Amino acid sequence: MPKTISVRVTTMDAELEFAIQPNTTGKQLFDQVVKTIGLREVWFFGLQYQDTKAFSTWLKLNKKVTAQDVRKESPLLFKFRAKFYPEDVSEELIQDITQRLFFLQVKEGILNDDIYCPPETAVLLASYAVQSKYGDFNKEVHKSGYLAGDKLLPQRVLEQHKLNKDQWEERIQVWHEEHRGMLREDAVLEYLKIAQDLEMYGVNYFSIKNKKGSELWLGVDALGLNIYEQNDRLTPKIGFPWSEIRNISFNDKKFVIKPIDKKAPDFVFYAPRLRINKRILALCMGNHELYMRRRK
Amino acid sequence: EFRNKRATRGTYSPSAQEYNVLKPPPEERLI
């Protein structure tokens, strides 16, 4: 291990470079990242890395970077990403940078099908992404095919319809023209206001089984924990708002939710690995912390 | 409110939790 360690941190739209030392903490690195990009609304964010087993891992801020399971690579690679989502972008995201980082991260998930989006909504979202990139539609510059180079729609939407690219561009262009006069920054915000109402937005999903051995999903989001049928990640089968949870715990693969009613039985589920239960508990603690902070 | 004395177990009680600069990201507490 060297006296000076090169680090690369990638945000959704920037590659940043830093130099740390053997005793540098995660927090010290994180502080350099956010200062560099002028981000004040820092509480949603974290640094992710691939560990020595090639699993994505959040960096602990109150520990030395070198004491964590980072890989034998130089430079060390991290991704700066939102770990937590606001309950309403309009209540919490004031800065342009914060809005932009959420917009790009969310858009990535919409485009890669991670966040389900109805086709007509996907077209509307695309049109706001276009307003943000291109500004006001102008018939003199934006000739037919001006969107040909852009990936604008989820792959599922493209595959499940029989429109070609020109036909999609037509639908998107009509909406683009409707947005005339909208600031590029306002288009980003409008995109987020639409996206945040999608049922899969802001939900961390985990593969679990119940006691009967049925496959399910567990979701952790800003408001609590939810259990979903394997084939329906849009509507919870069971919901657990924070206020209704007395305790959550795990032992290896077994996860237990204890309801506030002491006479009601515990809910038991099984995750694929200990690592997943640690992820679940960490996301619950962090979301609950921010939930309370909002309401202080 | 939180117990974690073994790397393979953890526990957190939401219902129990009660209430300068902009606040920092939540810190992971697990081993």
Swiss-Prot record, chain A:
Q: Which residues carry this modification: Phosphotyrosine?
A: Y116
Question: What keywords were assigned to this record?
Answer: Acetylation, Cell membrane, Cell projection, Cytoplasm, Cytoskeleton, Membrane, Phosphoprotein, S-nitrosylation
Phosphoprotein in keyword set = yes
Residues modified as N6-succinyllysine are: K83
N6-acetyllysine modification, residue list: K79, K139, K165
Processing after translation: Phosphorylation by ROCK2 suppresses the head-to-tail association of the N-terminal and C-terminal halves resulting in an opened conformation which is capable of actin and membrane-binding.
The residue numbers the entry assigns to motif [IL]-x-C-x-x-[DE] motif are 115-120
Record GO biological process: cellular response to testosterone stimulus; establishment of endothelial barrier; establishment of epithelial cell apical/basal polarity; gland morphogenesis; immunological synapse formation; membrane to membrane docking; positive regulation of early endosome to late endosome transport; positive regulation of gene expression
Select a single GO molecular function from the record's annotations and give it. Answer: double-stranded RNA binding
Q: Where in the cell is it found?
A: Cell membrane; Cytoplasm, Cytoskeleton; Apical cell membrane; Cell projection, Microvillus membrane
Q: GO cellular component annotations, sorted alphabetically?
A: apical part of cell; apical plasma membrane; basolateral plasma membrane; cell surface; cytoskeleton; cytosol; filopodium; focal adhesion
Q: Which positions does the record annotate as the modified residue S-nitrosocysteine?
A: C117
Q: How does it sit in the membrane?
A: Peripheral membrane protein
Please list the residues that carry the modification Phosphoserine: S74
Locate the FERM domain: which residues? 2-295
The entry summarizes the disruption phenotype as follows:
Moesin-deficient mice exhibit no obvious abnormalities in appearance or fertility, but display altered humoral immune responses.
SS bond list? none
Q: What does this protein do?
A: Ezrin-radixin-moesin (ERM) family protein that connects the actin cytoskeleton to the plasma membrane and thereby regulates the structure and function of specific domains of the cell cortex. Tethers actin filaments by oscillating between a resting and an activated state providing transient interactions between moesin and the actin cytoskeleton. Once phosphorylated on its C-terminal threonine, moesin is activated leading to interaction with F-actin and cytoskeletal rearrangement.
Q: What does its UniProt record remark on the domains?
A: The [IL]-x-C-x-x-[DE] motif is a proposed target motif for cysteine S-nitrosylation mediated by the iNOS-S100A8/A9 transnitrosylase complex.
Quaternary state and partners of this protein? In resting T-cells, part of a PAG1-NHERF1-MSN complex which is disrupted upon TCR activation. Interacts with NHERF1. Interacts with PPP1R16B. Interacts with SELPLG and SYK; these interactions mediate the activation of SYK by SELPLG. Interacts with PDPN (via cytoplasmic domain); this interaction activates RHOA and promotes epithelial-mesenchymal transition. Interacts with SPN/CD43 cytoplasmic tail. Interacts with CD44. Interacts with ICAM2. Interacts with ICAM3 (via C-terminus). Interacts with PDZD8. Interacts with F-actin. Interacts with CD46. Interacts with PTPN6.
Q: What is this protein called?
A: Moesin
Give the lineage. Answer: Eukaryota, Metazoa, Chordata, Craniata, Vertebrata
UniProtKB/Swiss-Prot annotation, chain B:
User: What does the UniProt record tell us about how this protein is modified after translation?
Assistant: Phosphorylated in the cytoplasmic domain.
Cytoplasmic-side positions:
3-31
Gene disruption: observed consequences:
Flies show severe disruptions in the organization of ectodermally derived epithelia and leading in some cases to cell death in these tissues. RNAi-mediated knockdown in the whole body or tracheae results in depletion of its binding partner sdt, twisted tracheal tubes, lack of gas filling and reduced apical surfaces of tracheal tube cells with death occurring at larval stage 2 or 3.
Indicate where this protein resides in the cell.
Apical cell membrane; Cytoplasm, Cytoskeleton, Spindle; Cell projection, Rhabdomere membrane
Which protein family is named in the record? Belongs to the Crumbs protein family.
Quaternary arrangement and interactors, per the entry?
Component of the SAC complex, a complex composed of crb, Patj and sdt. May interact with the par-6 complex, which is composed of par-6, baz and aPKC, via its interaction with Patj. Interacts with other proteins with Patj and sdt via its short cytoplasmic tail. Component of the CGX complex composed of crb, galla (galla-1 or galla-2) and Xpd. Able to interact independently (via intracellular domain) with galla-1, galla-2 and Xpd. Interacts with apn.
Task: Name the job this protein performs.
Answer: Plays a central role in cell polarity establishment, and contributes to the organization of zonula adherens, epithelial morphogenesis, and tissue growth. Participates in the assembly, positioning and maintenance of adherens junctions via its interaction with the SAC complex. Controls the coalescence of the spots of zonula adherens (ZA) into an adhesive ring around the cells. It may act as a signal.
The name of this protein is Protein crumbs
Instruction: Supply the source organism for this entry.
Output: Drosophila melanogaster (Fruit fly)
